[PDB]
Amino acid sequence: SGAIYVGNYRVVNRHLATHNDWANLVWEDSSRDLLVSSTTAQGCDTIARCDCQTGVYYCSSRRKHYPVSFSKPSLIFVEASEYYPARYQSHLMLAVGHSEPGDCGGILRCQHGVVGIVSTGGNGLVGFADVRDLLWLDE
């Protein structure tokens, strides 16, 4: 659970996208686990345009927001799931922090805005799919 609503766009983990996200598809990328679908209402989330490596993310499995240091967007091996075969996911940032599979979609934020959303995790780590490079979300 969890999405980013900026202007006329809904941003979700592609593996959790609904039929409505696919029937109103703008852009999707399985290598990033992202899908952006069109919306009728005007979303008000601000996207960060920055190179921050510290922030706060929401963890639904603990009902808690946690401060985290995270890595720079990169290609990281992600083990095979029911949604994807074993592959490298690009634009992924790791942090030391608790996460569980239902945590996908939890927003990562810094002082500048929305950085990305929980997409992977395990073993005391949490991986976030970055969205700061997607400049078309604001235009």
Ligand SMILES: NC(=O)[C@H]1CCCN(C(=O)Cc2cccc3ccoc23)C1
């Ligand atoms: N991006 C992917 O390919 C995902 C697809 C769903 C499964 N993936 C996970 O990482 C499961 C998982 C385990 C343990 C903690 C967490 C936190 C978020 O997912 C967690 C990989």
Ligand SMILES: [Zn+2]
């Ligand atoms: Zn920032």
